A paper describes a structure:
Based on these two early intermediate resistance features, we selected Envs from days 358 and 526, having both G300 and long hypervariable V1 loops of 18 and 28 amino acids, respectively, and Envs from days 836 and 949, having both N300 and short hypervariable V1 loops of 11 amino acids, to identify structural hurdles to DH270 antibody interaction. Despite poor sequence similarity, examination of the V1 loop regions of each unliganded Env structure demonstrated a structurally conserved hydrophobic core and variable hydrogen bonding and/or salt bridge formation that ensures coupling of the V1 loop to the V3 GDIR/K motif. The d836 and d949 Env V1 were markedly shorter but still retain the hydrophobic core and V3 GDIR/K motif coupled position of the earlier viruses. The d836 loop displayed a kink in the loop near the V3 GDIR/K motif leading to somewhat greater exposure of the motif. Visual inspection of the V3 GDIR/K motif in the G300-containing d358 and d526 Env maps suggested greater disorder in the broken sheet structure compared to that of the N300-containing d836 and d949 Env maps.
Numbering used by the authors:
A (entry chain D): 1 to 89, 94 to 105
B (entry chain A): 31 to 139, 150 to 188, 188B, 188C, 188D, 189 to 309, 312 to 321, 321E, ...
C (entry chain C): 1 to 52, 52A, 53 to 82, 82A, 82B, 82C, 83 to 100, 100A, ...
D (entry chain B), E (entry chain F), F (entry chain J): 520 to 664
G (entry chain E): 193 to 244
H (entry chain E): 83 to 134
């Protein structure tokens, strides 16, 4: 019973590199992302599709063009890779994650 | 361009929105005898004897029911007036003592809710005490299955929150209308056009010097005595997918609803101080029956199908199903309802058992230690009324919540009834009437020369 | 600045009831909403409920209708969650959270410490 | 009713009905002695302290402030009373350059006043310069010999 | 004292003392900085909440409301400041046709405007259209070419 | 800032900057919608009874009283709006006789009007009878035939 | 005491004196007071000798 | 004060409002005098007397 999805599923890249994540496809909503799991409860990273959240590094910024909705993640670190989530209204994704090294 | 055209025209029409307080206006004929404070307080001002309006050509303006602020102004003002009404004439209560009750046996049969209860108070002389019949209504006692309530004896429900205040016996409570006239430098704009979704431009616009009367009767999940819609059925709700937000549905046609407190009753006075008079029911007479309400099945069923078919417009192929109350406290789940000073809580399960695609009856219970409004303080204690009480009203709208969870195409959609924020009682009618200021210093370059 | 406190995780056996509590300090409870979120590794997060302490509206998620229950207590300033007939499916971690402001409820600025729940047999 | 009866009409039509705003910006229907209402009956309880008492006094004095401030801003330019005035100052280079035809033929003030708001201070400064020039010239004219 | 020392005199005599009411129409002996009384000594208890404080503010604001409303009704006809004004409009057919001699010779104004009260609005309308004609003529003269 | 930017300067310099007081004498930075401040955020508790509510109402109404009274004293002499005015009666014999040179060459107003303070009522009476002569002559001109 | 089946009697402040110290009245601007100096007035009808 | 020539006026004492105005005001000021500095009285207990 799912309408929301995101791509790409699993990504492999070294620490410090840059990658691109996107959420799909057409369902309306106030889009958002939640940070990778550090081990405790996660934190926010962005509001309203393109508004970087308070108290967050400047490595995060998204873009929205109707159905097209993408996010770039720059300068990854071993302290920031993990299981992160895409929010549309109430549902969530499929299980996206990024592994370091 | 001769002189390059600098000049000024006095006045000019132009306006911008602005936060600002509003003003009272109520029919000042009958309530000169309510010297103690009440909603449409006698002072206020007498109403305009000649309300006026005009239709404005080609005016394009966008209303917005959720963004405006005057509703919050009222939510503060009416609460403050309530407190100022129960600030004087109120006898703080040295109640909540060791006490005992037992089964009523008015007739040989046992009554349903009352229990004939002894009560040791303070006599006029502070040294002495005496026993009298007194207050018992089952929702307002801390229970136990033993020969007493509570761990033992009993106490009134208030006495670990705050001191309940006695309501003034002489102050009536009846919801007559009130009007609002902004002061000079301000005016009111009215969206006459129909089929309005609560936002976006409204074309048929008229300017009205003073807002029409509104009865701010408090209630939950059943709008009552509200002005009927213009035509058919509408859904004035700020965005449907936002299930957190509440959904308001408004009816063009009315439906009769009647409720009755059938039992005869009489109050007996009790003294609790030098000049402080307590009140509670003294005795009960005649046939015993619970408080209830009556409603016609056919009209209710018709209204629910009309609401269902109209709200289905906002979805392509989905179907709907109603359900009983969500849960939690009696205040929100049951149908909060007021007439004459006595209060009714009514279970609403029977009214929402239907589905989409002759005289129903309701169970109800009385409550008298009311944790009204915020639930944080200012707890009041109404006095019971003599004789029988019957009251009727025109149901006008309902509050709906969209639940949530995971959904799929071809699945069923479920709504539930809920009350909650009392602001959503007054947002129903006062969606009209934006407040606005005019800035009478328009300018534009035009040719001229002084001399 | 604001913080949310929890009593920690409690492990239990399949097929039974359980309770868990949370509280908030500062930014007064009586005005603004709350919500519960489920975190099961190897499975997606699933929103559970949203409670208005002002008047007690509850909007229990349909997939767990009935066996999950919740309430509040204004004077103590707490939030009780209840559920009945737990299974291994509810192997997860639980949180009490709030939105930034009291007009949106889908972008949660403040999260509790987290509280695991495991049942195996 | 002021502009509330003729707000959206043509550019020229607005000038013909500027006058009835004098009643509509001082009296108020309900605050005080008006064109429809007078002092209230139960004024003994209005003069005694009341929740709405401070509201009435606030509304009255706010209306007074509203009228007086703009009336002074109009008066200092020597335009007092004259519902249509005129100044001895040209218009600045920027903002400028919009044709007069549509502005009076079909346009209405509702769509015109927005874009001049941020530049509105400049007109006050230029009018102040005009009044300075006028008063010095008046003083010199007084100097007969 | 104004007409409190000259109310019942002749019409010609009344016009000769129309000025001093300006002090008597705004000052007030006791409410504020009058011609006889300054601020009171025990003002610490004046500023703190008191019944007579509300009385003071009520009286002051009512006087201000009154003066502003009258001066506005006088100003809109172009008569601001001029204690004697003049309008470019005739008088209607009814109510008229009274001989002028008694009105100026020995008449006193206390009994004069009793019968003019019900028709008083009509004079305001006539002066209003007078001002409308005057301002459009001013605009036409302003239109040099 | 009004005179607060150019108070102690020369006599002639003061006349050239009289205009920015109109904003300064009515607005107030903090009482109301100023040139820097608007209505407060938590106005629900300003409207509800509070000490500083009485303070703000008192201050605002006192400012209105002040401006209206002085404007009316200036208005009655026919000098409304005109920042520089002129009256139809020469100066009395006593006090008199001080040379003009120092006063405009180097004096500033601070030390000037202290001696004129006790005689100011005399100037008011002289301007009053001047206005009386002017209005009767206006009536005579009005008497065409 | 006689008071305790009517209302709670209030103690009078020992520091507050009580004397019939006089008070004048006077009206704000826009209002005035008129006085009938003439004698033998029956409480109604015209009064001739009138002073303000 | 001033005497006004030839002024004719009909004084009427029983109709005028200001007497009621002050009848309310003095009572309100009385209350505002005995609202502060006042000790609510828990008197009226058992007492016993005899010839002095
Ligand atoms: C929604 O809209 C509908 C439609 O408008 C509206 O319907 C009306 O609702 C009311 C109830 O809210 C219906 O019932 C009325 O109830 C009256 C009973 O109250 C009496 O007692 C009050 C207190 O005094 C008692 O106690 C003292 C001291 O103990 C004792 O001396 C007295 O004798 C009395 O026992 C009293 O306030 C009240 O009304 C009086 O005072 C008010 C306020 O000053 C004044 O406005 C009234 O005119 C009256 O003077 C009343 O005395 C009931 O009496 C009343 O009228 C019936 O009885 C009187 C007297 O017997 C008859 O003359 C009359 O013809 C009636 O038979 C009235 O019935 C009311 O009936 C509904 N309207 C209709 C048309 O049915 C709803 O209220 C709105 N709101 C909701 C939530 O639905
Ligand atoms: C209330 O409920 C709403 C759902 O009922 C909910 O959902 C949506 O929220 C967004 C807020 O971000 C609203 O805003 C936008 O609405 C447009 C309307 O479509 C028309 O206009 C677009 C113009 O959009 C351009 O600019 C945006 C950035 O602002 C770009 O992303 C976009 O790509 C464009 O560059 C126009 O393109 C549309 O054209 C169609 O064809 C083009 C070309 O193929 C497609 O690119 C496009 O996607 C579309 O297929 C069309 O003419 C919407 O298209 C935008 O995507 C964006 O959604 C929505 O209006 C709103 N939904 C509705 C139905 O109103 C709200 O969030 C909710 N609000 C609150 C406060 O709770
Ligand atoms: C004092 O205030 C309390 C708070 O409103 C009054 O209600 C009591 O509230 C508590 C809150 O937890 C109730 O607790 C019970 O907990 C058990 C735990 O198993 C649960 O099964 C019950 O359903 C309930 O939640 C308590 O029952 C409730 N009532 C009483 C009598 O304690 C309380 O009535 C007030 N008065 C007194 C004398 O406590
Ligand atoms: C309680 O309040 C009452 C009321 O003012 C106080 O006075 C009592 O008032 C009643 C009114 O009827 C008096 O009744 C007596 O009735 C007989 C009938 O034959 C008549 O002959 C008497 O002349 C008188 O009218 C009563 O005497 C009077 N006093 C008392 C002591 O009851 C009363 O004092 C207050 N205090 C108490 C403790 O009652």
């Amino acid at each position: 019973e799912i309408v929301l999805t995101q791509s790409p599923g699993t990504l492999s890249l070294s620490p410090g590199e840059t990658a691109i994540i996107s959420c799909r496809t057409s369902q309306y909503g106030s889009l958002a992302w939640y940070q990778q799991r550090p081990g405790q409860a996660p934190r926010l990273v962005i509001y309203s599709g393109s508004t970087r959240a308070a108290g967050i590094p400047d490595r995060f910024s998204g873009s929205r063009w109707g159905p097209d909705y993408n996010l770039t993640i720059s300068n990854l670190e071993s302290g920031d890779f993990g299981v992160y989530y895409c929010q549309q209204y109430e549902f969530f994704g499929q299980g996206t994650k990024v592994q370091v090294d | 361009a001769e002189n390059l055209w600098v000049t000024v025209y006095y006045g000019v029409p132009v306006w911008k929105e602005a936060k600002t307080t509003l003003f009272c206006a109520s029919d000042a004929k009958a309530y000169k005898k309510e010297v103690h404070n009440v909603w449409a307080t006698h002072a206020c001002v007498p109403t305009d004897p000649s309300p006026q309006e005009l239709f404005l050509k080609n005016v394009t303006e966008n209303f917005n029911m959720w963004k405006n602020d005057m509703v919050d102004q009222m939510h503060e003002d009416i609460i403050s007036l309530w407190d100022q009404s129960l600030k004087p004439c109120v006898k703080l209560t040295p109640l909540c003592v060791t006490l005992i009750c037992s089964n009523a046996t008015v007739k040989n049969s046992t009554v349903e809710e009352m229990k004939n209860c002894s009560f040791n108070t303070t006599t006029e002389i502070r040294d002495k005490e005496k026993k009298e019949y007194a207050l018992f209504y089952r929702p307002d006692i801390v229970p136990l299955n033993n020969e007493t309530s509570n761990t033992s004896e009993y106490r009134l429900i208030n006495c670990n929150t705050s001191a309940c205040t006695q309501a003034c016996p002489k102050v009536t409570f009846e919801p007559i209308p009130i009007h609002y006239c902004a002061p000079a430098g301000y005016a009111i704009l009215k969206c006459n056009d129909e089929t309005f979704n609560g936002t976006g431009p409204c074309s048929n616009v008229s300017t009205v010097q003073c807002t029409h009367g509104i009865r701010p009767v408090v209630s939950t999940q059943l709008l009552l005595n509200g002005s009927l819609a213009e035509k058919g059925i509408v859904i004035r709700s700020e965005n449907l997918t936002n299930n957190a937000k509440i959904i308001i549905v408004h009816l063009h046609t009315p439906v009769e609803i009647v409720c009755t407190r059938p039992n005869n009753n009489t109050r007996k006075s009790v003294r609790i101080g030098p000049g402080q008079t307590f009140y509670a029911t003294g005795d009960i007479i005649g046939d015993i029956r619970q408080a209830h309400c009556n409603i016609s099945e056919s009209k209710w069923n018709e209204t629910l199908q009309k609401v269902g078919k109209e709200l289905q417009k906002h979805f392509p192929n989905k179907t709907i199903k109603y359900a009983q109350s969500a849960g939690g406290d009696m205040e929100i789940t049951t149908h909060s309802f007021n007439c004459g000073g006595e209060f009714f809580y009514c279970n609403t399960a029977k009214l929402f058992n239907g589905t989409y695609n002759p005289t129903i009856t309701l169970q109800c219970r009385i409550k008298q230690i009311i944790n009204m409004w915020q639930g944080v303080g200012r707890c009041m204690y109404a006095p019971p009324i003599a004789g029988n009480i019957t009251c009727k009203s025109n149901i006008t709208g309902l509050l709906l919540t969209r639940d949530g969870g995971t959904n799929s195409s071809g699945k069923e959609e479920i709504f539930r009834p809920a009350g909650g924020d009392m602001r959503d009682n007054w947002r129903s009618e006062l969606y009209k009437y934006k407040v606005v200021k005019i800035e009478p210093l328009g300018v534009a370059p035009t040719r001229c020369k002084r001399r | 600045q604001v913080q949310l406190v929890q009593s920690g995780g409690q492990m239990k056996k399949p097929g039974e009831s359980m309770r868990i509590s949370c509280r908030a300090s500062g930014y007064e409870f009586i005005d603004c909403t709350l919500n519960w979120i489920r975190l099961a590794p190897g499975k997606r997060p699933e929103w559970m409920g949203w409670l208005k302490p002002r008047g007690g509206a509850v909007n229990y998620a349909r997939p767990l209708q009935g066996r999950v229950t919740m309430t509040r207590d204004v004077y103590s300033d707490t939030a009780f969650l209840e559920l009945r007939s737990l299974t291994v499916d509810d192997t997860a971690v639980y949180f009490c959270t709030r939105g930034k402001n009291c007009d949106y409820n889908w972008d949660f600025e403040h999260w509790g410490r987290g509280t695991p729940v495991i049942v195996s047999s | 009713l002021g502009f509330l009866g003729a707000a959206g009409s043509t550019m020229g039509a607005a000038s013909m009905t500027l006058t009835v705003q004098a009643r509509n910006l001082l009296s108020g229907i309900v605050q005080q002695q008006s064109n429809l209402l007078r002092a209230p009956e139960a004024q003994q309880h209005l003069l005694k302290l009341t929740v709405w008492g401070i509201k009435q006094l606030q509304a009255r004095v706010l209306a007074v402030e509203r009228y007086l401030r703009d009336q002074q801003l109009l008066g200092i330019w020597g335009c007092s009373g004259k519902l249509i005035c005129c100044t001895n100052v040209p218009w600045n280079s920027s903002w400028s350059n919009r044709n007069l035809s549509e502005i009076w033929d079909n346009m209405t003030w509702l769509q015109w006043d927005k874009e001049i708001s941020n530049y509105t201070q400049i007109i006050y400064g230029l009018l102040e310069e005009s009044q300075n020039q006028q008063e010095k010239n008046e003083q010199d004219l007084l100097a007969l010999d």
